[PDB]
Design a protein around this ligand. Sequence first.
Ligand SMILES: C[C@@H](NC(=O)CC[C@@H](N)C(=O)O)C(=O)NC[P@@](=O)(CCCCNCCCCN)OP(=O)(O)O
Ligand SMILES: C[C@@H](NC(=O)CC[C@@H](N)C(=O)O)C(=O)NC[P@@](=O)(CCCCNCCCCN)OP(=O)(O)O
Ligand SMILES: Nc1ncnc2c1ncn2[C@@H]1O[C@H](COP(=O)(O)OP(=O)(O)O)[C@@H](O)[C@H]1O
Ligand SMILES: Nc1ncnc2c1ncn2[C@@H]1O[C@H](COP(=O)(O)OP(=O)(O)O)[C@@H](O)[C@H]1O
Ligand SMILES: [Mg+2]
Ligand SMILES: [Mg+2]
Ligand SMILES: [Mg+2]
Ligand SMILES: [Mg+2]
Lengths: 589, 589
Amino acid sequence: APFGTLLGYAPGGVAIYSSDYVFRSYIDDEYMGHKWQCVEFARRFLFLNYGVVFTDVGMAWEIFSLRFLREVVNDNILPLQAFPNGSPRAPVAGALLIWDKGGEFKDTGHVAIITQLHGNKVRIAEQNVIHSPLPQGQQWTRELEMVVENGCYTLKDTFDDTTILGWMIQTEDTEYSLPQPEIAGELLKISGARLENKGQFDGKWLDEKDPLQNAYVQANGQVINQDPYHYYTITESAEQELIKATNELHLMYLHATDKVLKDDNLLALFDIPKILWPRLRLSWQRRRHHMITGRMDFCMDERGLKVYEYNADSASCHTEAGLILERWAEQGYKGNGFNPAEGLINELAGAWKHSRARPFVHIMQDKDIEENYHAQFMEQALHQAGFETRILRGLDELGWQLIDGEGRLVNCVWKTWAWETAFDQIREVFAAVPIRTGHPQNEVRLIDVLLRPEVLVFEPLWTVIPGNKAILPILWSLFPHHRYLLDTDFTVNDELVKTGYAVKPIAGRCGSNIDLVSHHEEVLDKTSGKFAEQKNIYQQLWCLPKVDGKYIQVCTFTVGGNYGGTCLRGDESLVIKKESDIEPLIVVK
Amino acid sequence: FGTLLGYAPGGVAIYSSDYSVFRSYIDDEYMGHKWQCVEFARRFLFLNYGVVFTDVGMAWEIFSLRFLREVVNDNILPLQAFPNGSPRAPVAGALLIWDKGGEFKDTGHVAIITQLHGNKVRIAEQNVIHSPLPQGQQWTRELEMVVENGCYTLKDTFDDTTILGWMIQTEDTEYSLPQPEIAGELLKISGARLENKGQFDGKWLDEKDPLQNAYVQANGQVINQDPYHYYTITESAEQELIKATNELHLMYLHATDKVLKDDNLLALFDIPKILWPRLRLSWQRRRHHMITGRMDFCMDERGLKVYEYNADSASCHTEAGLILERWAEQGYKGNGFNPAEGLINELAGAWKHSRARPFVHIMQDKDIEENYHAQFMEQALHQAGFETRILRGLDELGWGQLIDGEGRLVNCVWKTWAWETAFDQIREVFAAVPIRTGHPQNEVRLIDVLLRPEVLVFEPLWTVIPGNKAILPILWSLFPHHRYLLDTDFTVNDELVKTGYAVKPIAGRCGSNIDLVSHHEEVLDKTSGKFAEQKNIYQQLWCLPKVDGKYIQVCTFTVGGNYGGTCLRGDESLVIKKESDIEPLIVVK
Ligand SMILES: C[C@@H](NC(=O)CC[C@@H](N)C(=O)O)C(=O)NC[P@@](=O)(CCCCNCCCCN)OP(=O)(O)O
Ligand SMILES: C[C@@H](NC(=O)CC[C@@H](N)C(=O)O)C(=O)NC[P@@](=O)(CCCCNCCCCN)OP(=O)(O)O
Ligand SMILES: Nc1ncnc2c1ncn2[C@@H]1O[C@H](COP(=O)(O)OP(=O)(O)O)[C@@H](O)[C@H]1O
Ligand SMILES: Nc1ncnc2c1ncn2[C@@H]1O[C@H](COP(=O)(O)OP(=O)(O)O)[C@@H](O)[C@H]1O
Ligand SMILES: [Mg+2]
Ligand SMILES: [Mg+2]
Ligand SMILES: [Mg+2]
Ligand SMILES: [Mg+2]
C-alpha cells in the first residue's frame, strides 16, 4: 500500500503504516521518528503504552547498546537490560526485539515489539517489513519460531540471512543480562593527516561574494588554522560513539536540571539571584522543548570518552565546523571521508521550523567580531526555516513597549548574549526583576529585553542551569562513576587529590581562570580571566591528548537535543581558549 | 477599556477596565476577568513568583485565604494575613486587601505593595486608575504609612474605605491572624413553604421544551414529593460553599498529583497496572480538561464536611440547573435565588475553552436518567459551538477506525459511562490494554472506545483518581485536621472507633454498600449494592442534618475547576441514594 497507508494496529491500538517511499513524527511535543521507520513505531509503541522512550539512534541495531529508557511524564531515567538470543531470560511481551545489521536488514538492522509469547513461537509487531494491509483484527506482523532447550529461549527469524541480537526488558534485575558494551579505545584514536600541497589554499579559497563567508573573513581572514594542509581523522566507529555520548549526556543533563529546579538546596549552589528562581522554574515547565543548540566538550583518546562541560546557554563554533570546514573540504579534500558537521545548517533550520518561535526574530549580539559571523550564521538558518530577522549589535538601536530602530516591535529574540551578563545587571542593583519599561533618555539595558514577560527568548532561561558548572557535582551525584563523567566536587576531597584536578569557575567560559593540578600536586597550567571571584568546582584531572604538536579536543553540537555534528579545537597548551583554532576533521570508515 | 496604562514591577501590564472573551489566561492558567482588580493581583503573582490564589467572589475574600498554589507543580503554600496596624510590616510583593464598603462597595479591593518607605508605600493595582501612567512609573498610588511604637498602619487615599491588611507567603505565623471561621448559625438549613395556589397542579414543566420533556418522560411532572416546600440558606453559607469548593478542588488535585508520583500510593486504588502508564500521561496533558464534578457535604451549625467528590461521572445538573429554574419561575415570588441557576451557561463556558474537536459523540448507557442528562449536556455543547450526536448503547459503532452508525469517525466523545466500568472490562480478561481494532461481527466494547488512542474523552482518564475514595485517607494525610475533612483510613484505627465511622467502597456510588457504625458501636444504617467485594475506606461519622422530616445534604458543582452551583438531596434515611430527591433550594440575603 502507498506510503502512509494504515496496515493495522499493534497491541493497545498502536497504528502501523506502510513506508513504501512532513516526515518527522510527533505525538505532541515529543519526537517519535522518521516516517515510517521501524524505529518510529517501536518508540511510539513504548510511548503510547508505557510512557517511556529510547534516545535517538543512528540505526536500529544501535538500540541493543542502550542501557536506559526515559520516562516521559517526568524526564526520569529507567534501567534497561539487554539479552542475547538464547537467554535463560524469556522474551516477554512488550520487550524490544533487536536485529543486528546483516542480511535482509543490511546496515540499519531492525527493531520490533514482542506482542505475544507462546510455547513454540512468539508474535511481534513492526513497521518496516510489511507494506500490505493486515488480516482484520490481527495485532501482530509476523510469527517467529521459538525453541526452548534447558531453560533457554532462542528465536529463529523468518529470514535465512539475518542475526537477532536479542531482546531488552526494563527491569532492575540484571540476572542473565549483557554488560554494557564499550568500544575498543583503539578506535577512539585521533590521527594526523596531510593533503598534498598543490596550493589549493594559496589565495582566496573562501568565497567573499557570499555575505556569510565574507563576514567570517572580515573577522579572521582567509584562515581556519595554522596550516590548512593538515587535518585530523577519526573512525566512523568513534563518531558513532560520539553520537551515543551526546544524546545520552543531554538527557542526563535535562534530568539533572529537573532535580535542581525541584530542590532549593541544589538551586542555591548556582549563585543565581533568588528573585529569578520562580522565573527559572516557569521557563523549565513552559520552554522545556525549546533549546535549539548546545555544544559539548570532550576528551577523546584510547583512554575513553569524557565530558568537560556543556555550553547550553550560548555556544559558537557553528560557522567553523558547519560552513568554513565545508568549503575547506570542497577545496582540498578528495578522499572518501567526510565532514561530521556538514549537516549543521540544515539541522538548525529544522529545529527552528519546529520551534514555537514567532514570525519575526530579533537577533541580539554583543559587539564582538566572532559574534558577528555567528549571528549571521544563525540568521541564515532562520531564513531557511522561513523566518524574518534583523540583527542588533549592542542595545543602542533599542527603545520603548520595546521597539527597535525601524520602529518595529520586539517580541521574539535570539541572543548570543550570555544569561549571566543579564544576571550581573541584577546582581549590581524589590518585588520583581528590576527591569525598566520606561526611561527619560530612552536607555534600554539587557535585562530590560530578555526578562520582559512578552519577549520570546532563545536560548530559554532554564538553559542557564545545565550551562553552569555547578551542575557537574550534581551529575556525578545522580550517575556516580558513569562511564562518560569525571568526579566533580565543590571542594577538593581525597579522591581528587590522588587523581589530580581542574579548578573551574561555575559560570566562566573560554577557559578563563582555570587551574590544572596533577596527582603530584603540581600546577600543570593556569589562566586568568574576569571570573576570578566566582565559586569553583573541582573536577578530576584528565588531560587532552597531544597529536601533531597540538592538544586536540572533541566537541559535539546538540541540535534540539540530539547530535548535530562534531568538531575540533586544538591548542599548544592543555587548556582551550576563545582563541584556540578549529582544525579540519574528516571521519573515515 | 483594554487600554494599556502602564506596568507594575517586573514588567507587569495594567489595563483600564472602563465600560461602555472577558477571560484572561497566560497559557492554560486562568488569571481572572478583564480587567478587574483580582485579575491583576493574580497575574502579577503568577508572572513573578509563579503562584496564584484560588478563585473568589470578591477581592475582600482573598484576605480569608490561608494558602497559595505554586503553579509549576500544583503544590500548596502557606499564606498568612496581617491586620492594618501590625508589628509585621507590609513588605513588597505582598497582597493588600480592602474590605467592602465606601469606595469599594460590595467587592472590596486588592492591590500589590510595590515598595515600602519610611512614611509611605507604593502600590500597583487595576480598576482604580483608568488613566495612563507617567513614563516608567511602576506604581499606581502612594499611601501614607504611620509607623508608631513598632506598628505599621496604612491610610487609604479614600475617606470611606477600610484596609483589612496585607498578606505574606510564609510559614512564620507570629503576629498573624487565625483562619476565619464562619458563625455556626449562618449555616443552618431551613424549610419554607409557598402559598398553595395550584402552581404545580398541571404540566407546570413546559412540555414544549425537548430537554424538559425528556425529564418528564423519566420522572413525570415531578421533582420532589411536595413542590410547595423548599429549603433556604443564608448568602453567608453559599459564601462558605464557594470557598470550600474551590479549595477542596485544589486539595484534590494536589492529592491526585502525589498519588500519580508514587506507586505505593497508586497501588491503593486497585486499578489495572496496565493503565498506570496511561493515567500518568492523561494527568500531564489533560490537566486542565476536566469539565465538571460534584461534591457532597454535610452542612449545619456543626460546620462543613465533605463526603466525596464525583469527578469521574456525576449528574444532578438537569435537576438543579433546569427543572428547579422552571420551579422558581413557577411558584417563587421571593427575593432569593437558585444557587445553581447559571450552571448551563457555566458548562457551555468550559466547553468553549476546552480542546474538544468540532464534532462530539455523546456516549451513554441505557438508563432513563442518563437519557436526559446527556441531552442536557448535548445542549451545553450546542451553546458552545460543537456538533454532536447521542449514542445510546454501543450498537451503532463500527470499524479500521471507529465510526458511528452514519459512517462518521468517532475521535472525540463525552461519556456518562463510568471509567470504572471499562476497568472491569480489563479485569474480566497482554503487552497493552486489550482492545479490539476489529472483529468479525463488528462488535465494539466500551473499552474499545474509551481507550483507543486517537479518541478524545471527557472526562479525561485521571479523574478516576480524585473520583475514587481511596484518595480520602491521602487527603487526610496531606491535610490532617483540615476544617472540611474527616479522618479517613484504610482500617478502623483507634480514633474512628470512638467517633463512629462510615464504611464505603472506594469505587462505589449512589450510596451502594454503605455501612454506618456509631461511637456506641452499632450499625445505624446499612445498604446493599454491587460493589460489596471492593476495598473500603473508613470515614469519621458525621451524619446528615435532619430538617422538616428529611435528611438534607449539600452538593456543589465544579465546572472547569471552580464553583458552578449548589443543590440539595433529601432522604428518609441517613444515606443518600440514586433516587434520593432534589429538594428546591433558595439562597437568602
Ligand atoms: C557564545 C560565546 N560568547 C558569549 O557568550 C559572550 C557573552 C557576552 N557577550 C555576554 O553579554 O555575556 C562563548 O563564549 N561560548 C563559550 P563556547 O561555547 C564557544 C567559545 C568560542 C570559541 N571561538 C573560537 C574562535 C576561533 C577563531 N579562530 O565554548 P567554551 O569557551 O569552551 O565554553
Ligand atoms: C453519573 C452516574 N452514573 C454512572 O456513572 C453510571 C455509569 C454506567 N452507565 C456504567 O456502566 O459505567 C452516577 O452514578 N453518579 C454518581 P453521582 O454523581 C450522581 C448520582 C445521580 C443521582 N440522581 C438522582 C436523580 C433523582 C431523580 N428524582 O452521585 P453519588 O451517587 O452521590 O455518588
Ligand atoms: N578536568 C579537566 N582535565 C583536563 N583538562 C581540562 C579539565 N577541565 C577543563 N580542561 C581544559 O580546559 C578547557 C576549558 O574548560 P571547560 O571545562 O571547557 O570550561 P570553559 O567553559 O571555560 O571552556 C577545556 O577545553 C580543556 O582543554
Ligand atoms: N462519614 C460519613 N458519615 C455519615 N454519613 C455518611 C458519611 N459518608 C457518607 N455518608 C452518607 O452516605 C451517602 C453516600 O456516601 P458518598 O460518600 O456520597 O458515596 P456515594 O458515591 O455512594 O454517593 C452520603 O450521601 C451520606 O448520606
Ligand atoms: Mg570549554
Ligand atoms: Mg563554557
Ligand atoms: Mg454521594
Ligand atoms: Mg459517588
